[PDB]
Design a protein around this ligand. Structure first.
Ligand SMILES: OC[C@H]1O[C@@H](O[C@H]2[C@H](O)[C@@H](O)[C@H](O[C@H]3[C@H](O)[C@@H](O)[C@H](O[C@H]4[C@H](O)[C@@H](O)[C@H](O[C@H]5[C@H](O)[C@@H](O)[C@H](O)O[C@@H]5CO)O[C@@H]4CO)O[C@@H]3CO)O[C@@H]2CO)[C@H](O)[C@@H](O)[C@@H]1O
Ligand SMILES: *O[C@H]1[C@H](O)[C@@H](O)[C@H](O)O[C@@H]1CO
Length: 363
């Protein structure tokens, strides 16, 4: 079970890495490292949590639980998965969605609305529960499929704007006046629709692509999406309109839709983004641009490289894709900042090596 899945995506490349046995060993070693650093029982209520790094005092965000659950199931770590999920469940809010911010001592933060949920986190948690159902089965300690079905319904009810199907950034704010393209997970939504029978999720997927289509009016042909925008693709007040540490994830979530479902909107968008990054090449990727392509920060780190490698899967240039794979492996962030980028690195490595199949496919 799990890595190596040995599966073939139905569209695009199976993998952009060479020599699978060596890749598999690399992935397992990177997982052992991530687990050692990121998983703790301290402040976890009897369970386990994903901690952030020294730079934010080893707090937890719901996003990290989503990343950790996806990683744990892909690496066939059922006991760990279950303990991580017990921590999630100990943090479901009044809407059945995870508190987004908890300190290292297991107190929800009150200054920043820590009790509210972040939609990207719960969508990743829900997807991870579907993988667990499909990989392990739901007759044990945790009924993954029931938990998934509950979480998906809460996500729809609270994190989708009624009528328009615009994805909201949380359970209790935003929608048409402010959303986050990097949260847009069309492939996840198509899985939800198929898994649960709730076809409304397909309309959410379509609306995500429509918002990015509006962004194309403003991004100068680069494929870059803003961190935050309105449903019209225009700036969201008080929120970054640049391509920074939110927006970096868009190419990853979007490329998966191409690999899993053959979505031609995903390919068009990811090809544009990859082509933009081909201007400077793999070593030239930096950690902030305006959506018209102007560099606004100049650090080369794991928050930005692997997501570009993911976008490259949709086929703009497969030679460039191989270069991006190599760069993704090569650049690992130092440990003071070792939470975010190195988590995206491992998640994107799973995908670009052929180890993130659709959980509804034959595993
Ligand atoms: O006021 C509106 C509304 O807010 C609700 O609270 C929101 C909150 O405002 C959001 O910030 C939060 O968003 C979380 C998302 O799940 C997540 O995608 C994102 O992830 C962070 C990541 O955790 C962090 O490590 C990373 O940091 C990088 C920096 O951006 C760079 O500048 C720096 O150089 O490098 C670091 C990495 O080392 O950034 C990413 C991307 O932002 O952020 C949140 C998780 O940390 O969602 C909340 C819930 O919706 C509040 O609940 C409401 O009450 C209120 O009305
Ligand atoms: O986002 C962080 C960058 O990744 C890092 O290179 C710089 O030192 O600090 C930024 C803000 O914490």
């Amino acid at each position: 079970a799990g890595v190596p899945f040995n599966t073939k995506y139905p569209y695009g490349p199976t993998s952009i890495a060479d020599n699978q046995s060596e890749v598999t060993a690399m992935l397992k070693a990177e997982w052992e490292d991530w687990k050692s650093k990121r998983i703790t029982s301290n402040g976890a209520g009897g369970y386990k949590r994903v901690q952030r790094d020294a730079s934010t005092n080893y707090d937890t965000v719901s996003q990290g639980m989503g990343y950790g659950l996806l990683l744990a199931v892909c690496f066939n770590e059922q006991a760990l998965f279950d303990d991580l999920y017990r921590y999630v469940k100990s943090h479901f809010n009044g809407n059945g969605l995870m508190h987004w911010h908890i300190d290292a001592n297991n107190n929800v933060t009150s200054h920043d609305g820590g009790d509210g949920a972040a939609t990207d986190a719960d969508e990743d948690i829900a997807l991870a529960l579907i993988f667990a159902d499909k990989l392990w089965g739901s007759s044990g300690a945790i009924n993954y499929g029931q938990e998934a079905r509950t979480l998906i319904n809460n996500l729809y009810n609270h994190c989708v704007e009624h009528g328009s199907y615009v994805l909201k950034p949380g359970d209790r704010w935003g929608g048409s006046s402010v959303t986050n393209p990097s949260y847009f997970a069309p492939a996840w939504y198509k899985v939800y629709a198929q898994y649960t029978g709730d076809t409304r999720w397909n309309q959410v997927a379509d609306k995500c692509y429509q918002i990015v289509e509006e962004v194309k009016k403003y991004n100068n042909g680069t494929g870059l999406v803003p961190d935050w925008c309105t449903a019209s693709g225009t700036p969201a007040s008080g929120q970054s309109y640049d391509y920074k540490y939110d927006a970096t994830r868009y190419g990853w979530r979007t490329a998966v839709d191409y690999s899993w479902f053959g979505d031609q909107r995903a390919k068009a968008n990811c090809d544009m983004l990859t082509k933009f990054f081909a201007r400077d090449g793999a070593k030239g990727i930096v950690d902030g641009y305006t959506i018209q392509g102007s560099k606004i920060s100049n650090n080369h780190n794991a928050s930005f490289i692997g997501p570009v490698a993911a976008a490259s899967m949709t086929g703009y240039d497969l030679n460039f894709a191989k270069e991006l794979y190599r760069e993704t492996v090569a650049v690992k962030d130092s440990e003071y900042y070792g939470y975010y980028g190195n988590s995206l690195r491992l998640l994107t490595l799973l995908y670009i090596t052929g180890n993130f199949p659709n959980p509804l496919s034959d595993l």
